[PDB]
Point group: D2
Chain length 96, copies 4
């Protein structure tokens, strides 16, 4: 019923994220998604490279984020990872 | 010629940010905007409250961000602050 | 030969971290440990709760960190996690 | 009576921080120092360069941090900056 999975929408090299796609995860001082990280998986080396990290103060912002990936052609996929204090990490992989 | 100021676009309580509005600031390992922070200035108390912080690894992402402000009516303005390693902090205030 | 594992030293509720214990991991713009996160595993609920995150700009700081855990008795263990851009995540668990 | 100023202790290039020096600032979900950032002021260029940022989840950790400054001789001073949600930013400069 409650959704943690970081939806990814890709426009060129721009990536918009929300948790989750249809229902927005709670945003309170005691229940929150604190970070949304975006990783690129590299072609040259199969590295899981963190591109950046949206940190959100509990109950001050809802779990959205956006990134703009440098040199997108360098990656074979994107991995978004959302962290909820109560419910742990939830990831979503997009194949490029 | 080069722009650091974090453009803010507001859609309801959603805030899209890019540095800068017309020209995108460089994104390299030696020249980067490392963080984009969003603050709300509170009505009740005149506090400058950090809502969250988009951290970006040098040269891996371009300086964009988005936030979704909880309880937007609680604030009288939004303050975006971009940090460039070479050129320091650049802010932009939006009156609500 | 090269060490990524976050050494933990515990003094009361104070936690000192370095990667690694004997050899300090490189700190350059192209090879770095970017974050050191500390998690507490809760007794009440078996939750893996992120206590905080030391972010370090590539080549500007070496991979050390410290935390001071609130209400330490509430946890059954601490989990430190270091992220290296080239070599991924490395964790270390301490049973309390 | 309540202290926000980030005490700095320097051992070689190692920097230990606590807010404040004698009294530890509160650490609760509604009152917290959320970040402790360390800046180096460069000789070559007078730049205020962020070395890193200790982020702490409200009420999960007390406001301490440590850094280890790469190439310390390159700076003329260190600037620590603590952010409290209720009381704003508090800085402390150390001349090298
Ligand atoms: Fe949750
Ligand atoms: Fe710049
Ligand atoms: Fe490494
Ligand atoms: Fe305070």
């Amino acid at each position: 019923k409650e959704k943690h999975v970081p939806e990814m929408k890709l426009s060129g090299n721009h990536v918009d994220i929300r948790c989750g796609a249809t229902v927005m995860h709670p945003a309170t001082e005691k229940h929150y998604i604190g970070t949304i990280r975006l990783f690129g998986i590299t072609k040259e080396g199969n590295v899981t490279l963190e591109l950046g990290c949206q940190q959100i103060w509990p109950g001050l912002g809802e779990p959205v984020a956006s990134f703009r990936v440098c040199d997108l052609e360098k990656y074979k996929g994107l991995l978004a990872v959302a962290y909820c204090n109560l419910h742990g990490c939830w990831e979503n992989y997009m194949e490029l």
